[PDB]
């Protein structure tokens, strides 16, 4: 109506696509950001000045705010781009018909690299980021599930495990790990390698393609162990002042143009498929943007673990602060 | 030659820059950023993996690194574009004739307030900062001179005082703030506005305004008591090993198309006096990043403090060790 209220992650939305949308609709939308779910969750527990129409869940963290009630169901009929979206993404369990989100971007974790620092051939897998030879230089993403997942996968046991016997497992193996980080980062990634800061460590694909682009010699190794693959979707807080133009809003990124407007410019895949095909042909051949279904089978996808995130999130804390 | 080594601050080259100075020149260069001069000075003592042909120093610190040798002479004859900067920018003392230094980007420091949040009209000098109603809640930059700065100019004698006595002053009153201090950010000042963890503070004119046109409310009040004005420049380390291609980097950032293309992406007011003609209105208008000529009588540009330097460095070390 007058204004919307959009929180979503830092480097997702760029400058210039929320006036665009505002001129189309003359719907001005304050924006708000944020580095991870935890923190959206929280600060959807208890603040206004956090955000209030539009935010943007990661799909493990949908089930989980739908059944406590934070979110309410989305008028699909009024997501007139909704065909858009490539239907791999949409016959998921936490949300079988699609009612309480929209895949709005994804992307993956893997191993980054400054080739001009590290010749990236000598590293294949999580398990080399553990070595002495990387005593205080690596940068791990800050965010408690990828982390965990890392050392998980190196261990065997992996992903979304719910069994704490095998995460306190990846625990006290990332406690061995803590030696060797020498930063975390869920804002923007690729920024610690830039500054010279790290040469290798845990990146986001998206984040290592700006920095590309702006030239830091940094490559995206896939991790012989998997390759962590995850997607965030919008929707509306249960409570939101105007649902009706978070719908607009919705919507409007559910345009193949802006989506691929967005995807060519930011690197996080779009999990949107009239884009994709009109993806410029240099962004689409990336292998470590857009990943062949021979690495993203040997990857694994970010789920939700249940009554079993308390366990995950309180030993990354634990883990961060003893150090 | 073959590759090139360009130290710059963190968002001053948007993605697509150099890569396009490859395009014409084949020169390929290695793109490495920094937030203070503090630390690319010191990199300039010790790293091979720091930065080595083109560097980009502050105006204060071009007397400083000259007379130990740091950086060279540079060839004006080859810089065919320099005619296209201001007359008002080259003519000052740290530099007579411009042999070591070529304006490149030049702004300020000043207050920035989430309109949303705050209410603009109720902030005015550097000095409602220490009013206790902030506590813990302002974003102050992790640079020691514009700190102090604030500070000087809060207590009357300032800037660029080398006179001991008024810099111990300037330290004891900012203990008496930073219990205001909720973070310090020389990466991107408007980062922690956008992720709302501060509604106001310090902010640099550049990032204000990529976070308005991102979609954060971010306004920048000019400071009663001044607004420090601040300007960065090209030179070129005593020892590159590519001062030919550099001179080209040089050139090119020179060229008004390329001064105007990043001048409205970044904000930031360019030195290059071509372009700045060719200004998009909003933006040549644009009253936060062109400080009217009396904003700027009342400010007051960092200049060079010779050895008093250290006593500001070293206290303002302590003074962050302190909280």
Redesign the interface.
Known sequence: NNTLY?YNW?EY???????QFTKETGIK???????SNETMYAKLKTYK??AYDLVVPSTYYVDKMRKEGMIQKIDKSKLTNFSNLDPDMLNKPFDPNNDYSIPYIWGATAIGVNG??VDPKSVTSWADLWKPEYKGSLLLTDDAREVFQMALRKLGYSGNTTDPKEIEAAYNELKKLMPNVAAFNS?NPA?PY???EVNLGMIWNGSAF?AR?????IDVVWPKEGGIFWMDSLAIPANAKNKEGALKLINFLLRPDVAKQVAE?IGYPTPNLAARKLLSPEVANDKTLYPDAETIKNGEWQNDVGAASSIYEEYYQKLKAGR
Chains 1, 2 share one sequence.
């Open positions: 959009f830092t939305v760029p400058p210039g696509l929320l006036e939308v304050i924006y708000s950001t944020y580095e000045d956090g001009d620092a804002d920024n830039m500054e010279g700006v682009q702006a030239g830091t010699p410019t």
